[PDB]
Amino acid sequence: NDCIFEVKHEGKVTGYACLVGDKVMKPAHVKGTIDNADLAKLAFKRSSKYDLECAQIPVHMKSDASKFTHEKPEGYYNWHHGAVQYSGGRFTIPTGAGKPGDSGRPIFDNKGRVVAIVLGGANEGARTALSVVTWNKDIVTKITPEGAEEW
Amino acid sequence: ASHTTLGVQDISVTAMSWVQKITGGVGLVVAVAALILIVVLCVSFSRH
Amino acid sequence: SVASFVLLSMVGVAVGMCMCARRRCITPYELTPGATVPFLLSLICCIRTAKA
Numbered sequence: 133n134d135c136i137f138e139v140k141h142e143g144k145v146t147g148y149a150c151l152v153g154d155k156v157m158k159p160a161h162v163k164g165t166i167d168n169a170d171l172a173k174l175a176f177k178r179s180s181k182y183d184l185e186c187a188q189i190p191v192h193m194k195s196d197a198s199k200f201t202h203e204k205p206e207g208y209y210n211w212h213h214g215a216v217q218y219s220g221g222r223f224t225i226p227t228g229a230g231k232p233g234d235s236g237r238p239i240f241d242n243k244g245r246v247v248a249i250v251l252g253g254a255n256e257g258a259r260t261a262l263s264v265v266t267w268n269k270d271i272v273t274k275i276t277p278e279g280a281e282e283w
Numbered sequence: 284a285s286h287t288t289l290g291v292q293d294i295s296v297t298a299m300s301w302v303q304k305i306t307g308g309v310g311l312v313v314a315v316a317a318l319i320l321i322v323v324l325c326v327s328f329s330r331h
Numbered sequence: 332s333v334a335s336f337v338l339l340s341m342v343g344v345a346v347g348m349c350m351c352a353r354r355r356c357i358t359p360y361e362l363t364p365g366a367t368v369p370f371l372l373s374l375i376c377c378i379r380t381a382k383a
């Protein structure tokens with residue numbers, strides 16, 4: 133934990149950029165400059181398909197990036213605003229747990245490794261379906277439940 | 284003159300084959316680029 | 332007039348049979364929760380998933 137950085141704006145934080153493996157994850161819909169000076173200077177390749185902005189970590193100096201994994205067994209995970217529960221192909225939370233302005237928050241498994249980065253959520257009544265950027269064995273994927281709004 | 288003069292398309296030499304060769308080569312490279320782009324769109328349309 | 336009328340009616344019957352085939356080959360996938368329709372069958376029968 134504590135490896136993430138808030139992407140700062142003029143007067144408030146609009147999202148969170150996470151360090152995973154050797155890439156500086158950052159959602160693309162959120163805009164800002166990133167707090168840390170060096171990270172702001174990297175070339176961020178974008179993709180509207182996956183709503184992501186990533187760049188090679190200066191791994192010569194950043195040797196603290198979070199571990200990652202590709203398997204997502206159904207169970208319970210945590211995202212620093214509570215505990216996210218897995219079911220089928222959705223992530224659900226208590227309705228008030230999620231809030232705008234905290235998009236890009238990494239979510240971990242029980243062993244302290246990230247599995248997905250939240251982009252937004254759809255309030256389903258009691259639960260909130262999370263739109264996340266995860267990855268399978270090979271390549272990233274964007275699970276977007278119906279009616280999910282950006283954060 | 285004891286003949287007539289009309290538009291270009293029917294007056295070009297039989298050695299207009301240069302035009303056909305250049306146009307066909309450009310059309311081939313354009314078609315290959317379009318096919319590659321179509322294939323890339325197809326997998327990108329199935330990976331999401 | 333007769334030839335034109337029947338031929339357009341023939342193509343109408345053909346398109347109706349195509350629509351009926353699409354309905355009867357797609358409803359099993361519609362009823363089943365999970366929505367695992369393959370990409371190939373979605374393209375052939377001209378349907379889209381709920382995550383695209």
Ligand SMILES: CCCCCCCC/C=C/CCCCCCCC(=O)OC[C@H](COP(=O)(O)OCC[N+](C)(C)C)OC(=O)CCCCCCC/C=C/CCCCCCCC
Pocket residue numbers: 288289290291294299301302
């Ligand atoms: C390695 C490769 C080697 C191969 C090379 C092949 C060579 C290429 C050759 C072409 C040969 C052309 C021979 C045919 C010519 C005979 C046509 C004709 O018999 O005509 C001749 C007339 C006679 O002259 P005159 O004095 O009686 O007329 C003017 C009257 N005065 C003077 C009072 C103004 O001349 C006229 O009238 C013409 C007037 C109109 C001409 C202008 C044409 C306008 C075209 C515009 C195209 C627009 C671009 C389209 C882009 C759209 C985006 C997709």
